[PDB]
């Protein structure tokens, strides 16, 4: 009714090639957790914490130097008001324990670290993915969430064992709290990928991909969750599909949904809709680029970033402000 939108475009150069990006906001500053894993005879796996300074990423710390982990570990990063907690967990079954390396920091640069073990963890046989998250307040305590999803099911006797979360109330030291997710629209004979919780205004929701049998594409799904029992959430799907546009990412600004779309599965252009009304067009052409991988990074309830990698090493940062003027 009484809202306005402002956008600016900025660019960031990166000197290291990141196989995957994980952006987070710490004290209103943009950071990146960059997994660098070239497979050359001389190369080593790096997990850099980077910080935006001027128009370039500045590497602050290589977390991976502290661990003997092989492969590409799961990365679970959490931002509290003053603290950053990053977990590197072994990439996997027969074993019932998961070993993680916990990194802690009060600033963006200096990290303390130690090893933890989540013995007999209740996410056995669930698919885990890397993501950044916020604390979720249940009762009078705040929790960090590690959530997984069953990759595939033929028959589903219990619709509470499809999405399952492990929770910690001591800043990621111990993970003994089970949070039950009821998701009735979990489909049988369908493969699930890349489950990520989104937490905003102490509300829980999940963003993930679903594989398509007919066409060889992965479709974005988004479910919103309501808190019912203390440690139980029920989650239903939320439809964002629109014709001749492919759903990409979802976020919330000004207590409304903002949604990015691509024109096709190649993401030549990108459209961002605010409450499904006002839209802004992203043209990463001025060329040969695209807006694949575009994701929202929320700064506060009115300020958000939309980030995608134009070309190799270049990041397009669209800053979005959306609020009521009265």
């Amino acid at each position, epitope marked *: 009714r009484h809202v306005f939108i402002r956008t600016e475009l900025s660019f960031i150069k990166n000197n290291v090639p990141c196989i995957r990006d994980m952006f987070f906001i710490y004290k209103r500053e943009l950071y990146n957790i960059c997994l660098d894993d070239l497979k050359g005879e001389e190369d080593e796996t790096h997990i850099y914490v980077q910080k935006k300074v001027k128009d370039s990423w500045i590497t602050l710390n290589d977390l991976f*130097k*502290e*661990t*003997d*982990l*092989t*492969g590409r570990p799961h990365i679970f990063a959490y931002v509290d008001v003053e603290e950053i907690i990053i977990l590197l967990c*072994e*990439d*996997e079954n027969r*074993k019932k*324990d998961m*070993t993680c390396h916990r990194f802690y920091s009060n600033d963006g640069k200096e990290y*303390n*670290n*130690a*090893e933890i073990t989540i013995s007999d963890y209740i996410l056995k046989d669930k698919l885990l993915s890397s993501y950044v998250s916020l604390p979720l307040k249940i009762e009078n305590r705040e929790y960090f969430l590690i959530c997984g999803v069953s990759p595939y099911k033929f028959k589903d006797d219990n619709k509470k064992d499809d999405i399952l979360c492990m929770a910690s109330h001591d800043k990621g030291e111990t993970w003994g709290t089970k949070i039950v997710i009821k998701y009735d629209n979990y489909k049988l004979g369908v493969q699930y990928f890349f489950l990520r919780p989104y937490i905003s205004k102490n509300d829980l929701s999940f963003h993930f991909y679903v594989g398509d049998n007919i066409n060889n594409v992965k479709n974005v799904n988004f479910i919103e969750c309501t808190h019912e029992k203390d440690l139980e959430f029920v989650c239903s799907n939320r439809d964002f599909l629109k014709d001749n546009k492919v759903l990409q990412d979802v976020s919330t600004l000004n207590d409304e949904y903002i949604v990015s779309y691509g024109n096709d599965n190649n993401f030549a252009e990108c459209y961002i809709f605010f409450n499904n009304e006002n839209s802004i067009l992203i043209k990463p052409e001025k060329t040969a680029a695209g807006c694949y991988g575009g994701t929202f990074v929320k700064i506060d309830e009115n300020r958000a970033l939309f980030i995608y990698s134009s070309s190799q090493g270049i990041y397009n940062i669209h800053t979005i402000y959306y609020a009521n003027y009265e």
Partner: antibody
Amino acid sequence: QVQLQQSGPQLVRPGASVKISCKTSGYSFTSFWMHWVKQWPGQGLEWIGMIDPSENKIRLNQNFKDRATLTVDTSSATAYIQFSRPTSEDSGVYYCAMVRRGYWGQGTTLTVSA
Amino acid sequence: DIQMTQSPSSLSASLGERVSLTCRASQEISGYLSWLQRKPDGTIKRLIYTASTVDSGVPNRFSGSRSGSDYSLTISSLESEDFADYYCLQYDTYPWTFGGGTKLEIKR
């Protein structure tokens, strides 16, 4: 509950191939690099190298380039270090360790003498 | 290779004393320094990593610190258990390298 049990003492003559084992339990053997450290007789420690059991990739101190060879058997979760043509210089105590985890084996004494 | 020079190479002190071992790096190692204890029975234990973080299960009388190129391990109150050999270890650049070691003995 990680455990690293190495093999017992060995006395071999120069030029006779010798192999030291380190059997692991209580963790995913392929999830962690395995290091080897040498304790020199009457002196200090020296890092030999490390092996990735999942990739069979090796980072070796070049002071041991043509002396030691590291292998793994993921089926039995044991790491090996072998001296194909050992000399008197190779005598010492050899440790297997996940150095950046703090888990060390008890050490294996190797004596090379004619 | 990075040379770690460790001092003192030998040190004697009595029970309950405070001792401080210094390890100097020939180039920047960015705090990737560990302290290890080699007991008389040959067993090796990690005490400190990332220069000042005390490993779990290590008594609180152990601590580490850094001032520029110098890294130090400090034992505030010496106990009978603490008399053994000590090594620093840089794990910043391959190949990883140890200090020459410190043998700590009891003063009577």
